Amino acid sequence: SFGQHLLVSEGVLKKIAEELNIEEGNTVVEVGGGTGNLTKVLLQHPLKKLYVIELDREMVENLKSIGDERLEVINEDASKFPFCSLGKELKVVGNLPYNVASLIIENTVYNKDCVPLAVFMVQKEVAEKLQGKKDTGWLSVFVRTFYDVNYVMTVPPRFFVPPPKVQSAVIKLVKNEKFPVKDLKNYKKFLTKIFQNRRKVLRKKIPEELLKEAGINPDARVEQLSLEDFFKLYRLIEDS
Secondary structure, eight states: OOOSSOEEOHHHHHHHHHHTTOOTTOEEEEEESOHHHHHHHHTTSOOSEEEEEOOOHHHHHHHTTSOOTTEEEEOSOTTTOOGGGSOSSOEEEEEOOTTTHHHHHHHHHHTGGGOSEEEEEEEHHHHHHHHTSSOOOHHHHHHHHHEEEEEEEEEOGGGEESOOSSOEEEEEEEEOOOSOOOOHHHHHHHHHHHHSSTTSOGGGTSOHHHHHHTTOOTTOOGGGOOHHHHHHHHHHHHOO
């Protein structure tokens, strides 16, 4: 049966499902780990359809054993899958393994046109970066350009077996597109680049002329920039 590799406290799974605000007619897309037990919790809610995207073929077999007519299992990679091939309005949820969390979140953003809401459990550090208050990163800016990031709760290691070495957190992404970025791949190129060598003053990474035009101190560093700064820089560099 389930819980073969990971056990998560049921209270935590229930809170995660509650954050999704599942209502009649909703389509939910579940990604990440411990899908057996999370799936059972999600199916207690009035969703219309639940897709589970899972690479583990033994787990696929076990999930398929669940009778519910609303459940459909897709044996593909959630860090690469085009979510918008599943439907026009999807709520995405998952406990994300450390080594694919950032990819899955990035992929969710590429699919933002059909993802109004996502709830993820990730390492506390990843969550704090995404929130953008205590820390930041290229993915944080990429995400927050298109979503509001809500830090829901901290999850100490004890709520997992085996426990992780660091605390986890639940975050909620709510679609909110703040800037009209058309080419997401190109925007990512810009953000990844400007975040390389995070300690380097910006004048070593962006021509001073453009920094002054954007009203940015040439001796500022990338982690002190606002979203508005990133967009205006992006536009200045694209128009050059």
